[PDB]
Amino acid sequence: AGLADALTAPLDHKDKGLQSLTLDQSVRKNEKLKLAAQGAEKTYGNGDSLNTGKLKNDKVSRFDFIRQIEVDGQLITLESGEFQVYKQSHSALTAFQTEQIQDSEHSGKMVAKRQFRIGDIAGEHTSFDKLPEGGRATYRGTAFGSDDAGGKLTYTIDFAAKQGNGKIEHLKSPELNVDLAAADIKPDGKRHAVISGSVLYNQAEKGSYSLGIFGGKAQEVAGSAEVKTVNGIRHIGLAAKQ
């Protein structure tokens, strides 16, 4: 799966999909994120990039992670688990499957805990001002949550109307297979084309979702959804391509 090289090989201009994913949200500013897989290992600071060019496109790549803080020369484990990376050609996102968290009583002591969250969503953000003037685009891809990367994402953008809607299907937990209700393409603060909208389950609003448009020709979409459940918000990574 190219996990070791992703962690240790230099960016190669010849590598496919998105070559480099900037870990901004994945590594907190005063922390370190150590990734391991396949007998390789790399520690990342905020703003370092993961060599996604080594990873397979349209798949979840999995790494053990140890979220760390360096104090007085010592690396103290804050959290550990699985680090997931989904790669497209113009975008990619990361997710954390927490499995352990530093014990509230003795530092150096870990406790078992499972939580799932999206980290970064980045790549070649499409400029709102450079969007196609008309026509539509259909995006087909993946929806992935905790213990489940088997979801189907379908998404349609009408560029003339600057509106998008779509559907999530086949996640094992039934209440995650939500509709991504029609929402407007709007410019970011950086004028990136983004979509923020409601999620529907049986036509009832059950959370929200946000996608960015990626690629110079709006080739891809990526972001996440939040689905309200009796156990809290569940997070679902979203990525699709024309």
Containing structural domain, residue 148: 127-242
Residues of the chain with a following break (C to N over 2.5 Å): none
Clarify whether residues 138 and 180 are in a common domain: yes
Give the residue from 62, 122, 134 showing the smallest Cα distance to 96: 62
Q: Which residues pair with 99 in a beta bridge?
A: none
User: Of the residues 97, 126, 155, which one is the last residue of a structural domain?
Assistant: 126
Clarify whether residues 113 and 131 are in a common domain: no
Clarify whether residues 43 and 154 are in a common domain: no
CA distance from start to end of the chain: 24
153 and 178 Cβ atoms separated by less than 8 Å: no
* HSE value, Cβ hemisphere, 13 Å, CA-based, for 132: 16
User: Of the residues 74, 93, 126, which one is the last residue of a structural domain?
Assistant: 126
- Determined by X-ray
Query: What radius of gyration, in Å, describes the C-alpha atoms of the chain?
Result: 18
Give the residue from 84, 85, 79, 76 showing the smallest Cα distance to 98: 79
CATH number, position 81 = 2.60.40.1980
Supply 219's token pair: 């080739």
How far apart are the C-alpha atoms of 233 and 77, rounded to whole Å?
26
Nearest 5°: the CA angle 236, 85, 209 is: 25
Structural domains counted in the chain: 2
Find where tokens 């450079």 sit: 130
Clarify whether residues 103 and 143 are in a common domain: no
CATH number, position 143 = 2.40.160.90
Clarify whether residues 23 and 47 are in a common domain: yes
3-state secondary structure the chain: CCHHHHHHCCCCCCCCCCCCEECCCCCCCCCEEEEEECCEEEEECCCCEECHHHCCCCCEEEEEEEEEEEECCEEEEEEEEEEEEEECCCEEEEEEEEEEEECCCCCCCEEEEEEEEEEEEEECECEHHHCCCCCEEEEEEEEEECCEEEEEEEEEEECCCCEEEEEEECCCCHHHCCEEEEEEEEECCCCEEEEEEEEEECCEEEEEEEEEEECCCCCEEEEEEEEEECCEEEEEEEEEEC
Give the residue from 179, 180, 147 showing the smallest Cα distance to 60: 147
How far apart are the C-alpha atoms of 178 and 138, rounded to whole Å?
18
Supply 239's token pair: 């990525």
Give the residue from 203, 18, 162 showing the smallest Cα distance to 93: 18
How far apart are the C-alpha atoms of 161 and 156, rounded to whole Å?
11
